[PDB]
Amino acid sequence: TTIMAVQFDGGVVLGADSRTTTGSYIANRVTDKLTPIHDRIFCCRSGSAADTQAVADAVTYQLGFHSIELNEPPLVHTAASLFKEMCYRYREDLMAGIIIAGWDPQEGGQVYSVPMGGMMVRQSFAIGGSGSSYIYGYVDATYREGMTKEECLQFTANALALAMERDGSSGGVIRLAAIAESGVERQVLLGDQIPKFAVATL
Template sequence: MEPDPPNASTVLEETCGTTTFVCEYEGGIMMGADTRTTLGPYVSNRESDKITKIADNIYCCRSGSSADTQAICNLATYHMDLDVADGLREMQDPPLVYRAASLFRDIFRENEGNIKAAMIIAGWDRVKGSQVYALPSNGVLVRQNCALGGSGSSYILGYVDKEWRSNMKREDCMEFMKTALSLAMARDYASGGLINIGVMETEKPMEKHIFTQQELLRYCNYQRTL
């Protein structure tokens, strides 16, 4: 005898209950996120990578439903590849960041009300240099120098507004980002795990840096299990 199907009201959706943070600094762009995903009140994955590659020069930070954000990233990447097949750009040329961001925006608008997601798309190109685009769930695309996303971002908005500067050195920006993400992870139950930071500079591949719980304790006096 086959078991009864699960009650729809008890099925939990995996979410990137998240803190994402992207900002420009003097030499490029820095993207940071925690690594925790959740199923309701349960931690389902402690080491999820929420910084997703769209092209060699473009990445996005994902927050919201894991299934939705992964599907959207796959669809956007597919359309970016079609641009080459359709002759809109040469294969050796890096794609435009705004082109990628507008694809995400169009997907959000075409599926309005059916997806639970927010994105921050960032990268560099040879036309406009470094760029950061925030895309909340309502599908309104906004270019910003500094963008936050996810449930943990509300805890650090004031701190980031006060401390961020457009001309930060790379080392200062790294310390600033680690502090901000640590503060958010200490207060937001859905953010935790490790800190994943990606550094992008023009004509260079992204550098990924992972910071463990023990390395983060000095950035935040309020301690809990990350």
């Protein structure tokens, strides 16, 4: 799988492939790996789908309870810390690589990466999954400070397309989410909508 997030001024953008493989077999070719933990907070799931869904639902539960208790919107650092505590307590049991993303008033758009092992780091852009390997170079090269929402969306789409082409485990369609003060606008790119990079020919 391939997941990707990037922070823009006033929000974040999330991107992920739509393929889950059991071995060399694609059980679901249209799965949604973007899970909303809350109205303005999202999660991108890599690794064991079971583990990720379980921790996602549990964190959603804990965070909704915390938010309704406080009567204030939750913080992305808080959500990521919950994920971190869970994945570190159960680091031996579950294999899960998470990248949490959302917006809050006080800190704005935030992206946190909770890889396997239960560590947590804020990142301007972060990628995960089997396919992330194949695009580390592309993101290290073409990233720019101060990108816009449209620019970050195109960046994410290009990266996920490259990873989808090269990696077998990632493919299908690209799911995108842009989170900001107003809300979340989700869009799905299929067919020609995916950026196409020409394969070499002799």
